């Protein structure tokens, strides 16, 4: 996505466009004839201002792509005249070099889920100092839209956030994670952004919604104060029993006295929430009577919530995907059983030459405990492919905890080559599916190279991967892909220009939470076979029976990774550490029930095309 997917949903958000158009109309008609749009994007708000009757509008845009996009959009609405587009950061605008005079109004949307994270403060400190007329002591004085913001917080239970920042278990498929290894997420990048109005498994409010801070965007003396201001130590009373998983954060923008917009979680709004995961506590269970403690500081750009507590030893930093992995139990229970079945078929004497062990290579991209599980099964010499030294220490300490004598687990990294001179691999684990929901690049090549390093009857895991698909009517996937005409942009012609950058395939999708309608059943779209390349789909057609009548907009897809013909891992399972993906159609097709719809699935290297025929 060269053009950020936020651009599509926000331009389709008719409410937001109307609230901003009314607020700018109000300001213009009250004398604000000179407007500066910071982060103009497609330049809709700048076009609003000129349409409202502003004399001169100046639209600055950081991104080259978005700047060139606005030039076309503004030019195409026959408004190139009174609006100057500036490929620049706000900070680098100078009067009179770039803009003739100081402006009487600033409009800005440089706002993320945690409000401050797109540098609105720094931008508006500069604006008052250099670009804006003096404030009120109208065409005489300068003002900003939005005028002010109120930042809210809420302690929440949410097992979906939990499984991404905390390792919930003490034992994974036979191996024990020692108490002396403390797994922390990277958020211990201070907040993640989630559409909490549809987060899988929902969330529960453990506290009442509380006020984290306020900001007056029309007060320069206040904005300059935030960098040095001492953190606000607070404690929020608990109102419901549950597990403290995160502090869910949103805000309310006051554009003017009459118009406001909230990022409060809602299936009506497009807005996402700042999620501050809770970790590094002995217990997470909170009850009515207890207090959620935290320090709030906005000193260096981001809103920070540190020192989260409740009032009534090696550290291994894992990625969220790696924590999710450690919590994906079926994945590890499957791998344990699938490996042992192969260890039994080769040399069942070695399953729990004496000096010769089972050679097991794990080529999993990131952190993985598959080698340890293997080590517990029999006379096995397992190899780790972890790069990070922090990961090596953790796995060494896990190995110690699972009664491995020193140097039992080896580290391959410090090219796919034989384990020894005249010895071959009994099992080779490969990384087939990206977290994105697409196939790993050069998987067929690594699979082919790996086939030749195998012992007689040895196995690459997974042996094959089936991609499953689904016909869905999803307005949501459609409205996140392409702008729906002119109506939503309030008569302005922007859709034909932004929709040039239409993504064919949506990645990092939470299929489970997606609002859509199934028009079919999950159907096998292609086979990717690691043991037998010949059974790989080159470019095959699939006949999909249409179970429900509706407007086909997308084909969500996931995988069934087969370790053997019996044991299969699902990349769409509840505990899955993979996200799913979807082919979104450029033009939606109306499908009738009882109809045998054809899909043209082309597969080359790790790329897959799906089209309606
Ligand atoms: C509650 C949050 C939220 N929830 C849900 C969806 C969306 C969103 C919010 N939107 C999120 C994507 C941030 C937009 S940034 C606005 C646009 O303006 C540009 N920009 C950014 C800073 C800047 C500058 N100093 N000078 C000039 N242009 C500047 C950026 O490159 C960008 O194109």
Curated annotation (Swiss-Prot):
Keywords: Cytoplasm, Methyltransferase, Repeat, S-adenosyl-L-methionine, TPR repeat, Transferase
Keyword Heme assigned: no
Organism of this sequence: Homo sapiens (Human)
Domain SAM-dependent MTase PRMT-type: 1-305, 328-613
Subcellular location per the Swiss-Prot or TrEMBL entry: Cytoplasm
Name of the protein: Protein arginine N-methyltransferase 9
Keyword S-adenosyl-L-methionine: yes
Temperature note: Optimum temperature is 37 degrees Celsius.
GO biological process: chromatin remodeling; methylation; mRNA processing; regulation of DNA-templated transcription
Main location: cytoplasm
Molecular function in Gene Ontology: histone methyltransferase activity; protein-arginine N-methyltransferase activity; protein-arginine omega-N symmetric methyltransferase activity
pH dependence, entry free text: Optimum pH is between 7.5 and 8.0.
Range covered out of full length: 147 to 844 of 845
GO cellular component, one term: nucleus
Complexes and interactors: Found in a complex with PRMT9, SF3B2 and SF3B4. Interacts with SF3B2.
Lineage of producing organism: Eukaryota, Metazoa, Chordata, Craniata, Vertebrata
Class of enzymatic activity (EC top level): transferase
Function: Arginine methyltransferase that can both catalyze the formation of omega-N monomethylarginine (MMA) and symmetrical dimethylarginine (sDMA). Specifically mediates the symmetrical dimethylation of SF3B2. Involved in the regulation of alternative splicing of pre-mRNA.
Effect listed in the UniProt record for changing residue 112 to G: Abolishes enzymatic activity
Catalytic activity, reaction form: L-arginyl-[protein] + 2 S-adenosyl-L-methionine = N(omega),N(omega)'-dimethyl-L-arginyl-[protein] + 2 S-adenosyl-L-homocysteine + 2 H(+)
Family statement: Belongs to the class I-like SAM-binding methyltransferase superfamily. Protein arginine N-methyltransferase family.
EC number(s) reported in the record: 2.1.1.320
